[PDB]
């Protein structure tokens, strides 16, 4: 039975959110560290009983859902709400096999035809990440949307939007101290808002940064990685040093 971390939006604070994301990181990692950045477990040869962690979310209305995250990339692969569980379309038959080990006692299992990458979820949501507000309120609402989906109360664009919210506030926050800090600001002020390009370009570039760092020459990138600032202006990262405060977890490479 996989490790569970619990979080509630009801009365959430910057401290309780911080404690939550720190705990999620602690279960994702163990660690293996390259140029000072922790590396997630290699998917190859990883035993199945170590492959996943569970995040149980609930809100003031006492609605609860449990997300499953893949420890190899910290990303959401599916969720359970009561008698039903739903999984993104797996990319290969090894991953398809792996998720049969999740929520094994649930009476109804479903695998969506679509995967959980942003390109696809944005389409289904009818909005880009740039136009989807994040915050404690949005998380509170996403929990409910996920909860009501099996009984037909949640439209598909709402569900997609709710995934996009959960994935950013949990997976991307775990991956990036920077994104964790951005979510803290919204919680602090109880003020929702959409992510700006500084957040969006880090998300889009997580795999490329993981590669750049692990393949670097003493921390120096073989080729620079371009990101955007809040105002859209472009800049390059040439070295791991400037990312030490920014990126917290890397997908395994070599």
């Amino acid at each position, epitope marked *: 039975q996989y490790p569970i971390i619990n979080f509630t939006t009801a009365g959430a604070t910057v401290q309780s959110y911080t404690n939550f994301i720190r705990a999620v990181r602690g279960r994702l990692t163990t660690a293996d560290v390259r140029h000072e950045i922790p590396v997630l477990p290699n998917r190859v040869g990883l035993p199945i009983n170590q492959r996943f962690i569970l995040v149980e979310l609930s809100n003031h209305a006492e609605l609860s859902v449990t997300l499953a995250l893949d420890v190899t990339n910290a990303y959401v692969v599916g969720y359970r709400a009561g008698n039903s569980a739903y999984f993104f379309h797996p990319d290969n038959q090894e991953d398809a096999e792996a998720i049969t080990h999740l929520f094994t006692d649930v009476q109804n299992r479903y695998t969506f035809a679509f995967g959980g990458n942003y390109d696809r979820l944005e389409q289904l949501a009818g909005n880009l990440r740039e136009n989807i507000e994040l915050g404690n309120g949005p998380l509170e*609402e996403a929990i409910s949307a996920l909860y009501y989906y099996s009984t037909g*109360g949640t439209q598909l664009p709402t569900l997609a939007r709710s995934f996009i919210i959960c994935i950013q506030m949990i997976s991307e926050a775990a991956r990036f101290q920077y994104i964790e800090g951005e979510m803290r600001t919204r919680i602090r002020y109880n003020r929702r808002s959409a992510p700006d390009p500084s957040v969006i370009t880090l998300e889009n570039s997580w795999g490329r940064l993981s590669t750049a760092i692990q393949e670097s020459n003493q921390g120096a990138f073989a080729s620079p990685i371009q990101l955007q600032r809040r105002n859209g202006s472009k800049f390059s990262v040439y070295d791991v040093s400037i990312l030490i405060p920014i990126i917290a977890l890397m997908v395994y490479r070599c």
Partner: nanobody
Amino acid sequence: AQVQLVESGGGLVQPGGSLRLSCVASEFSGFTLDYYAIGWFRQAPGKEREGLSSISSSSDGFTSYSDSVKGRFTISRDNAKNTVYLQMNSLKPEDTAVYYCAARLGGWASFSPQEYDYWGQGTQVTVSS
């Protein structure tokens, strides 16, 4: 016993007038109305139901308004009276319709009738002289 929503406040009004609709939740349902999202809808004989204004269950008080009513309508809460209000100012004849409230426990600010669970009985609003 499920929550029951009782509406009031509709009626005849002339152009430029206002009404205030109330959505009053029944006593002795478990959760109080501040735990719910509440959406307002209207529906005219030919037309399908139409979302106009909604307030989330979220604690940041998030509200949504359709372009037809922004700046004129205001949705608000009176928790002491287990009530949500819809203040409708600057009414014009094509606001004429039956108006409905709807609620969902832990809900979000939706314009889709499918994303609520409980409905008020409806109340007619007519604007003309």
